[PDB]
């Protein structure tokens, strides 16, 4: 008997969706996990001013390796062995 207007999810007069208990428990546990993450993310170690350049050498070496790997692009080698053994298609009982 009760008819819903155009699209029960978008528009003006829409079918309202409510909350039960599973969603509340999920929100509670997610908020607890996020508060635990906030607590564990409330303590540094080097206090910013003690890391002006501790692992920059590794980054520079990795960048040099990536550059050497990207600048070493060349077509593969071409040998005569393939062109010679391709003649074995018409091989008989030899």
């Amino acid at each position: 008997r009760g008819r819903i207007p155009g699209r029960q999810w978008i528009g003006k007069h829409r079918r309202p969706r409510f909350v039960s208990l599973r969603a509340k428990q999920n929100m509670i546990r997610r908020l607890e996990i996020e508060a635990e993450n906030h607590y564990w993310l409330s303590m540094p170690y080097m206090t910013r001013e003690q890391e002006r350049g501790h692992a920059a050498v590794r980054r520079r070496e990795a960048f040099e390796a990536i550059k050497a790997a990207a600048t070493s692009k060349f077509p593969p080698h071409r040998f005569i062995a393939d062109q010679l053994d391709h003649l074995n298609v018409t091989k008989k009982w030899s």
Binding site: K12, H13, R14, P16, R17, F18, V19, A23, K24, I28
Partner: peptide, 25 residues
């Protein structure tokens, strides 16, 4: 699309409704 202030109450979003229902007095 409707404006921010209207007379028909305008039901909020699902996430906003869940947040308001889980954070009651």
């Amino acid at each position: 699309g409707s404006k921010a202030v209207t007379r028909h109450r305008r039901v909020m979003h699902f996430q906003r409704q869940k947040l308001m229902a889980v954070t009651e007095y």
